[PDB]
Write a protein that binds this DNA or RNA. Structure first.
Ligand SMILES: Nc1ccn([C@H]2C[C@H](O)[C@@H](COP(=O)(O)C(F)(F)P(=O)(O)OP(=O)(O)O)O2)c(=O)n1
Ligand SMILES: [Cl-]
Ligand SMILES: [Cl-]
Ligand SMILES: [Cl-]
Ligand SMILES: [Cl-]
Ligand SMILES: [Mg+2]
Ligand SMILES: [Mg+2]
Ligand code: NA
Ligand code: NA
Length: 326
DNA sequence: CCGACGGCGCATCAGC
DNA sequence: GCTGATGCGA
DNA sequence: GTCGG
């Protein structure tokens, strides 16, 4: 909140470039600048001072000076008035509707929540669910509720097979007071980078959670990733809790550390760390950290026994989860 | 100046 | 049916 | 839009 005005402006500019301009790199550039400014420990006084931060160039510097002076950004004033842009922006807020589909719908005259509801037939499954719980998905999740959800998931997973280990990551693991959703990393000894000694490992868990009515809907479901909806049980006379998005990722047990690092985030932190890895001659994904030969092709997986091991390979001091919220 | 910018899972599609 | 490309998402 | 070579 120290430089809230400027970061909000940058984030809005970022969303515009992504949803309307479909210029993903401009999107990341803005988000990075927004992130770097967000942790700057001083109340920014000028674009010049801001340009000293990495990721902030001449363009954002000018925009910051404009914002600091007037208290707004004309470029944004306009974007906010353009009915097409605003419509595209809105629709992309429905889970399942990206920049392409949004532009396509608007070109069909479908540009509001009301239009989407009467044209439900024109939506694929994911979009149908995103629209159904549109309101709820906008709501944040108090950490207290996250704790209750964790308890339900861990206990139900334990019931399926005591050998399962379920770890809630995402912003929760980073210590956030509230989260946009629940992200669950799941492991089981019967599934490693060496073999899949038992099939349906993820299925069984998803099934158990549906059986006790915690999981209510499914957006997508594969062998290692589940994307759906859940809801905490409410007491008698108590109004129901909002429905929530839940992601579950089954990762090879022998690759837990690269897995938990990836799933802990943040997303911008992962980008920056993976970008730093490249500059150091390494490539990192949710399974391994591999070296890059002179040729450029990824080499063999390096031995990892802790999140810190990954940080060492790239010559970075270890950072606790609470300090990776970029 | 200009090429890189993180990496991948699932759903859906076109082309065979 | 397969692969590969795309959209959308983590 | 920003960066580094
Ligand atoms: N583009 C991305 C997106 C995600 N992630 C990893 C790193 C992320 O931490 C993790 C979770 O994705 P999430 O989509 O639940 C998230 F990011 F919003 P979270 O941090 O959990 O914040 P919230 O509370 O609001 O959910 O996936 C990533 O690596 N790249
Ligand atoms: Cl771009
Ligand atoms: Cl503004
Ligand atoms: Cl690992
Ligand atoms: Cl790999
Ligand atoms: Mg999350
Ligand atoms: Mg998530
Ligand atoms: Na800079
Ligand atoms: Na969307």
């Amino acid at each position: 909140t120290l430089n809230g005005g400027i970061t909000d402006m940058l984030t809005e500019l970022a969303n515009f470039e992504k949803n309307v301009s479909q210029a993903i790199h401009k999107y990341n550039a803005y988000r990075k600048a927004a992130s770097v400014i967000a942790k700057y420990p001083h109340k920014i006084k000028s674009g010049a001072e801001a340009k000293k931060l990495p990721g902030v160039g001449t363009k954002i510097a000018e925009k910051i000076d404009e914002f600091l002076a007037t208290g707004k950004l004309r470029k944004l004033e306009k974007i906010r008035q353009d009915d097409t842009s605003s419509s595209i922006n809105f629709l992309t807020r429905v889970s399942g509707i990206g920049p392409s589909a949004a532009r396509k719908f608007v070109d069909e005259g479908i540009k509001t929540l009301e239009d989407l509801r009467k044209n439900e037939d024109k939506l694929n499954h994911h979009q149908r669910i995103g629209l159904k719980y549109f309101g709820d998905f906008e709501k944040r999740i108090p950490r207290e509720e996250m704790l209750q959800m964790q308890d339900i998931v861990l206990n139900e997973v334990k019931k399926v097979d005591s050998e399962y280990i379920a770890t809630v990551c995402g912003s929760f693991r980073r210590g956030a007071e509230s989260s946009g959703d629940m992200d669950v990393l799941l492991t089981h000894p019967s599934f490693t980078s060496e073999s899949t000694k038992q099939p349906k490992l993820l299925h069984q868990v998803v099934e158990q959670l549906q059986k006790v009515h915690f999981i209510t809907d499914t957006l997508s479901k594969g062998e290692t990733k589940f994307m759906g909806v859940c809801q905490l049980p409410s007491k008698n006379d108590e109004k129901e809790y909002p429905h929530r998005r839940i992601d579950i990722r089954l990762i090879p047990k022998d690759q837990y550390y690269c897995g938990v690092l990836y799933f802990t985030g943040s997303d911008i932190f992962n980008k920056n760390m993976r970008a730093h890895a490249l500059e150091k001659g390494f490539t990192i994904n949710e399974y391994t950290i591999r070296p890059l030969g002179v040729t450029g092709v990824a080499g063999e997986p390096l031995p990892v026994d802790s999140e810190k091991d990954i940080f060492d390979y790239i010559q970075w001091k270890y950072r606790e989860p609470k300090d990776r919220s970029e």
